[PDB]
Design a protein around this ligand. Structure first.
Ligand SMILES: [Zn+2]
Ligand SMILES: [Zn+2]
Ligand SMILES: [Zn+2]
Ligand SMILES: [Zn+2]
Ligand SMILES: [Zn+2]
Ligand SMILES: [Zn+2]
Ligand SMILES: [Zn+2]
Ligand SMILES: [Zn+2]
Lengths: 274, 274, 274, 274
C-alpha cells in the first residue's frame, strides 16, 4: 500500500539498520545510512509527505546532487529504534535544484535532522556516482567491531589492511578487489573527514576510520551491507587468529591472483605486491 | 490505551531490560533499572493501580524524592522475564511526602519488592537530580561483560579506566566526557555501596563496580542504555585489542582534545593528562 | 486453556530450551532437561494424554520417584526444535508405583524416548530431593561454552574451579555458595556417569563434566537456568581475562567472606581456603 | 496447504538458512544449501510450478542424478533473505533424464540460477548417495567462523584437525567418527573444487575448505546443520582454549576409544593414532 512505511525503501532502511544493530555495530547513535532514490520511488507517496517540508542548507554546494531524493538516518537517532518508529528516525530529503540544500519531505519528526555525517555521505555519493557511472546508491557507516579492533593493531595502511582482509576470508578479494582505503584518525562530523572519505571512495568501496568504524558504498542496501559484513567477517576471523598467536598459514599471493583471474577482478596492486 | 502495560514507561522498561538481557548483561537477576516519572505520567492509569498499595520504608530518609513516582525492577526478578510479565517483574512506586518510604501502586505482584540495590538507585537519583538540575531520570545497573572483564586487568582508577575507554571508540569522549568513576569492590545491596555510588555520580554519569558491573545515569532510558552500550562497546574493542597483544596505535591525547573542542565538551582533566 | 502445550510447564520447557539454544549451549541434540511435576499439574490435561501410553523400564529401580510425573526432553532431539513441535521433542512421563519404569503419557511422538542421560537426571533428582527436602525440581544439562573451555585450562578440582568462578562475577558465591562439583571425564549416557553426577549433586547444585558440559539443579526452571547462566557468565568473563593475560586483581578471600556473611550463605570451605 | 512456501522442504530450507545467518556463518551470499527431494515431495505442488520451467545444463553429466528433484539456494543470494522471499532466493530444480541439465520448476525468480557451488553440491550428493546407500540427502556449505579461524593455525591435515575437533567437545567423535576431510586451498566455484570435495565426501561427512569454510552431508537438514554446528561448537571451544594459551588437559586417546566403543562407532584410525 501507499503507506510509505511499507515502501521498499523504508522497509529496506529498517532491515539494514536493524540488522546492523543486531550485529553489535551500532551502539547508541553510532552509524548512519543514506540511500539515493529516484523521483519515481517517492512520487506515489506524495500524500504521505509533510504538508510543510522543512528546508536545511547543505554544508557546501553539491550541484551533482541537484533534485535528488534520499532516505537518510537522523542525527542522534539509534539504529535500534528505526524499526519502532521509522518516521522519527529516518527522513526522506530532496536536494534542491542548485544543490545548496534540501527539503525534508517525510520523517525526521520533532525537529530531527539528517545524520551529522551528511558531508561524508553526500560527498561520497557524489564521488561514487562518478566512479561507478551512477550505479552506487548507498553509503553506510557503522562501528564494525572487529574492523575497529584491527585498527589498533594492524598498520593503518591501505595495502597492508587490504591484504590482511583478503587473507581472512576467501571471498574478500572478489567482494572488494579495489581494497579498503584507510584515513588517518580525524574529527568526525566535519567536512574535512567527509571530503577525505569521499576522496578515498574514488578508489575504494570501503573506507576505514581508525578507532571509529567503516564506510561502505554499493548499488543496493543489501550489497552495501553485505560488503561491510564481508570485511567485518574477515576481521572477526583475523581477530581470532591473532588472538591465537597469528597465522601458521594463509591465502598466498599466488592464490589471490588465481582467485582474481577466475572471478574477472583486478586486485589492488599494492595489496597484491605484499 | 489506558492499559498501563502499553504506557510509554512500561513499554520503555520492557525494551531496556529485554535489550540488556539480549546483550548478555543480565544473567539471572543480575542488574536493576529505575526510572523517575512525573505524576502526569501515571495519573491516567490510576484505575490500573492496586486497590490496596503496599507500603515499604526506605533504607534512610530521602526527602528530595518526596512524592516522586518511579518505575523499578523487582528484587530477584530476571530481566529476561520483564517482557513476559511486566506486572510480576516491575513496579510503580511513589515515595511518600516525607521521603521515608513508598507505596507500591502497581506491579510487584505476589509480594515482590523493588530491587535490592534501591539504595544505590535512589541515592544516585538524588545526586544526579542535583548534578543535572533535574534532567537525569534513569539509573541503570547491568553486568556489562567486557567492562567487568576489564576490571580484572586495568588499573581500577578513574583516570586510567576513563582514558582507555575513550581510546577504545572515538565517540566515547563525547558520550562520557566526565569519564567513568570506579569504586573499590564493595558488598552489593548495602547503603555503603549505594552512597559510594551516589557520591561518584556527583562527578560521573558512569560508575564501575569492580568484578561486578556498571551503573549509568541519564535523562531517558535510551540515553542511559546507550551510555552503557557505548562504554561496553569500547570495552569489547579493548578486550579484543588486549587479547591480540595490545595497542600498536591509539587515539592520542591531542586527538581527544580536538574531539572535545569540536563537540563542546570538557574532558575529565585527569584522564586527559595521561 | 487445557491445550497442554499452553500449560505453564510445557511453556516453561519451551522457554528454557529455546533460551539455551540461543545462548549457543545446545548444538544438535546437546543438552537435556527434566522437570519434576505434581499430579495436580498434569491432571487437568488427561484428555491430552496419549490414549495408549508407552511403557519403558528405568535403568535401575528408583523407588523414591514412584508415581512421580516429569516433563523431559527427548533423546536425539534438538533444543532448537522444542518451540516448533513440543510434542515431538518433549514428553510427560510418569514413573510407575515401584519406580521400575515409566509411562509416556504425552509427547515423544514417533517412537521417541526420554534423554539418553535419564540416569544422570533421575538419579540426580533423587539426591537433590533428599538434599533439599524436596525443594529442587529441575535438572538441566547443557554445553555451556565458556565453562567447557575452562575445563581444558583450569585444574579440574572442585575447590580451584569454584574459587575461580566465584572470582569471575560478584554474585557467584551467593548463587552457588556450595560451589561446583567436577567429575573426571566419563563416558556419557551411562549409569556410571549418572550416579557419579548424582553423588556430586549431594554436595553441589552444579556439576561439571570436563570437555563436555554442566549439570545444574534448582527449584524452578528459571532458578536452574539462572544458576547455569551465572556460572557460564563468570566463565565468559574468566575466558576474556585469561585471554588478556590473566588477573591483575580479583575478588579477595576476605571479600568473598564478607559477601557470604552479608547474604547469609556458607561458602564452600575448600574453595575459600585457597 | 498446497502453498509450496509452507511445504516441509521450503520451510526446512528457510529454517536452515535463517539459523545459519543468525550464527554469523553466512555473510553476504556466503554459503549454499541443497536438499535432494523425492517426486512425491513436489508432486502435490505442481500447480505452484513455473508454467515455463527454465533449462540449465549441468557442468558435466551426472547420470546418477537423472530425474532427481532438489531444492537449492540461488547464486549470489543471501541466506538472510531466504525467509523474506523464498521464491527469489531458493529454487526447485529437477535434473533431466540423462543427468545433463535441469529444469527450474519453482523459484529462482528474476533470472536467478542455482548456487555457483552446484558442482561441489551435486558431485558430493552423488558420492554421498553411493557412500550411504542413498541415506544422505543434504549438502550444506557455510562460512563457520571458528572452523575458518582454525584453518590458519592448525595443521591442515585430516588426522590432526579431526583429532583436535574430537577433543574440543565430547560428542564430536560420536557425531563425526569418520572425521573431517581437509582440502588444500582451491579456487571456489570450479569443478576442480567440486570433485575434490566430492572425493573427500567418500570418506568423511565434513570437508574443510581452508580460509573459506566447511561442507557437511547428512540425511536431513537438521542432521546436516547439527553436524556442522557440532564441529563449529568444538572449534569455538578450541579457539577460546588456544587463546588462553592452549590445553592443560584434554580428552585422551583412551577416552576417545572408550567413547567409540560405547556408541558403536569406528573412529578414524589416523586421528586416533595421534
Ligand atoms: Zn561513527
Ligand atoms: Zn502532494
Ligand atoms: Zn549487580
Ligand atoms: Zn484510582
Ligand atoms: Zn551433553
Ligand atoms: Zn483421561
Ligand atoms: Zn563459500
Ligand atoms: Zn502442473
Amino acid at each position: 500500500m501507499q503507506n510509505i512505511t511499507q515502501s521498499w525503501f523504508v522497509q529496506g532502511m529498517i532491515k539494514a539498520t536493524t540488522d546492523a544493530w543486531l550485529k553489535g555495530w551500532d551502539e547508541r547513535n553510532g552509524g548512519n545510512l543514506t540511500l539515493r532514490l529516484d523521483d519515481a520511488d517517492i512520487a506515489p507517496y506524495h500524500d504521505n509527505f509533510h504538508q510543510q517540508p522543512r528546508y536545511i542548507p547543505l554544508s557546501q554546494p553539491m550541484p551533482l546532487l541537484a533534485n535528488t531524493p534520499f532516505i537518510v538516518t537522523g542525527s542522534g537517532k539509534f539504529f535500534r529504534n528505526v524499526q519502532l518508529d521509522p518516521a522519527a528516525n529516518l527522513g526522506i530529503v530532496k536536494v534542491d535544484s542548485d544543490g545548496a540544500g534540501y527539503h525534508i519531505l517525510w520523517g525526521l519528526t520533532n525537529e530531527a535532522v539528517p545524520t551529522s555525517e551528511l558531508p561524508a555521505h553526500f560527498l561520497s555519493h557524489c564521488e561514487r556516482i562518478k566512479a561507478t557511472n551512477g550505479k552506487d546508491r548507498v553509503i553506510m557507516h557503522c562501528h564494525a567491531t572487529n574492523l575497529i579492533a584491527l585498527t589498533y593493531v594492524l598498520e593503518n595502511d591501505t595495502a597492508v589492511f587490504t591484504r590482511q582482509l583478503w587473507e581472512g576470508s576467501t571471498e574478500c578479494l572478489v567482494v572488494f578487489p579495489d581494497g579498503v582505503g584507510i584515513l588517518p584518525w580525524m574529527v568526525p562530523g566535519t567536512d574535512a573527514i567527509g571530503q577525505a572519505t569521499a576522496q578515498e571512495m574514488q578508489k575504494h568501496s570501503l573506507v576505514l576510520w581508525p578507532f571509529h568504524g567503516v564506510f561502505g558504498s554499493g548499488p543496493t542496501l543489501d550489497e552495501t551491507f553485505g560488503l561491510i559484513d564481508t570485511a567485518e567477517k574477515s576481521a572477526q576471523v583475523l581477530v581470532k587468529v591473532y588472538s591465537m598467536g597469528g597465522m601458521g598459514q594463509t591465502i598466498s599471493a599466488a592464490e589471490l591472483i588465481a582467485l582474481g583471474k577466475r572471478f574477472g577482478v583486478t586486485p589492488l596492486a599494492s595489496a597484491l605486491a605484499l
